[PDB]
Design an enzyme around this catalytic site. Structure first.
Site, PDB file in Angstrom:
ATOM      1  N   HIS A  63      -7.858  48.745  -1.010  1.00 54.84           N
ATOM      2  CA  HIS A  63      -6.717  48.507  -1.882  1.00 54.84           C
ATOM      3  C   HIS A  63      -6.570  49.676  -2.872  1.00 54.84           C
ATOM      4  CE1 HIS A  63      -3.629  46.726  -4.327  1.00 54.84           C
ATOM      5  NE2 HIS A  63      -3.631  45.564  -3.643  1.00 54.84           N
ATOM      6  N   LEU A  92     -10.341  41.316   2.724  1.00 55.45           N
ATOM      7  CA  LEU A  92     -10.814  40.052   3.256  1.00 55.45           C
ATOM      8  C   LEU A  92      -9.771  39.436   4.195  1.00 55.45           C
ATOM      9  CD1 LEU A  92     -12.594  38.506   0.184  1.00 55.45           C
ATOM     10  CD2 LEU A  92     -13.576  39.653   2.176  1.00 55.45           C
TER      11      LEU A  92
END
Lengths: 120, 121
Positions: free
Chosen positions: A9, A70
């Site tokens: 990210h 995730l």
């Protein structure tokens, strides 16, 4: 010939990028790939395009991009695929990008979660 | 007496919540805890406060909150700790105690998973 590019990210805080670095470091010492590069989607360098270019430069023809997230999300279904030119709207050579799958609810995530519950 | 509450980001897409649900199911099947609850920080139910309250209802006095995030960040340093009243900015009985745990981090097992993912496993 092969390159593993870990992609994450990225935040304004540094913890997101420390993780990726650490992970890349651990994959390096497993001696599985010739070239290993990290790329952060936002706020931090190296950027995803930068990582891919670096991998090409070191001579890789198979670029395996793994999304270190995730769960799937807009970042993995749109943002990253664009950056990789896998989706319409960085230009590779004859080289091939292989975009892989996120972590998901792996049995090993359960393993880790249980340890964390106990302060391990 | 003890409760595990898994807590995640939450998105407008459903994948984040599905992850949490699957994980919670797996933890249930290991028979380690009496009560297991999920809470999502934004956009989805259950919410973190909801999950904590639910756990109290079922009679837990040890609430272990585990942040299912790869890395620390503002959400784990500030937002979630507020929601837990661990940090000055829902409301917790004297009987119960919150144990806020640590994120996944760069676990050796994450490397294991990453390698498998690289190979389409």
């Amino acid at each position: 010939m092969e390159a593993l590019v870990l992609v994450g990210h990225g935040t304004r805080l540094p913890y997101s990028k420390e993780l990726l670095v650490k992970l890349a470091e651990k994959v390096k010492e497993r001696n599985l790939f010739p070239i290993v590069e990290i790329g952060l989607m936002e706020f931090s360098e190296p950027t995803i395009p930068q990582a891919v270019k670096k991998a090409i430069e070191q001579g890789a023809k198979r670029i395996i991009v793994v999304p270190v997230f995730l769960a799937h999300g807009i970042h993995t279904t749109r943002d990253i695929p664009r950056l990789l030119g896998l989706i319409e709207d960085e230009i590779p050579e004859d080289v091939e990008i292989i975009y892989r799958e996120p972590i998901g609810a792996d049995d090993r995530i359960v393993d880790i979660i249980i340890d964390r519950a106990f302060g391990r």
